[PDB]
Amino acid sequence: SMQEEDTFRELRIFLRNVTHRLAIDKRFRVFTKPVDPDEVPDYVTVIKQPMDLSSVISKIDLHKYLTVKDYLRDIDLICSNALEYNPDRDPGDRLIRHRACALRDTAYAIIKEELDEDFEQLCEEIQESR
Ligand SMILES: CC(=O)C1CSC(NC(=O)[C@@H](C)NC(=N)N)N1
Ligand SMILES: CC(=O)C1CSC(NC(=O)[C@@H](C)NC(=N)N)N1
């Protein structure tokens, strides 16, 4: 229905705002764009399902997220991919892991503070009826 489409549009507006706030954070610059194959060639090999904040924005605009849970699974994927690609004790790897975990923590904290739980439940119940 029209009211249901209004609900998903409000969700997209909210998700764009969260994603923008993550993308402008200097700590998260390494996650804003796909990994460039030149600067690092083994990434395409190790990481089967790449995700970054620019791809998240594209999926929002393609109406791919109908719930907050669909969105956070892609935030979770940005994080888990970074931990998998950077497992070593060396400081370069450790720095990316710390930033990845901070990105995930920040997104969850924004949603916990600013998303009404009844709004997320509505999105869920609309989606379960489709
Ligand atoms: C998005 C992501 O996970 C990235 C982007 S650059 C990076 N890691 C590195 O440049 C070094 C520190 N570690 C390697 N294993 N090459 N990890
Ligand atoms: C997913 C993962 O590997 C981890 C390990 S610890 C973490 N986040 C934290 O400890 C946040 C909540 N606190 C900080 N003072 N940083 N995330």
* Residues of the domain holding 55: 1-130
Q: What is the resolution of this structure in A?
A: 1.8
Locate the ligand 2 atom nearest the alpha carbon of residue 101 and give its number.
17
The residue contributing the CA closest to ligand 1 atom 5 is 30
d(CA 101, CA 65): 22
d(CA 113, CA 106): 11
How many folded domains does the chain comprise?
1
CB 65 within 8 A of CB 59: yes
H or E element in which residue 23 lies: helix 2-23
d(CA 106, CA 12): 18
What spatial distance separates the first Cα and last Cα of the chain, rounded to whole Å? 12
DSSP 41: T
| Interval between CA 22 and ligand 2 midpoint (Å) | 17
Neighbours of 4 (CB within 10 A): 14
Rounded to 5 degrees, what angle do the CA atoms 94, 97, 102 make?
A: 125
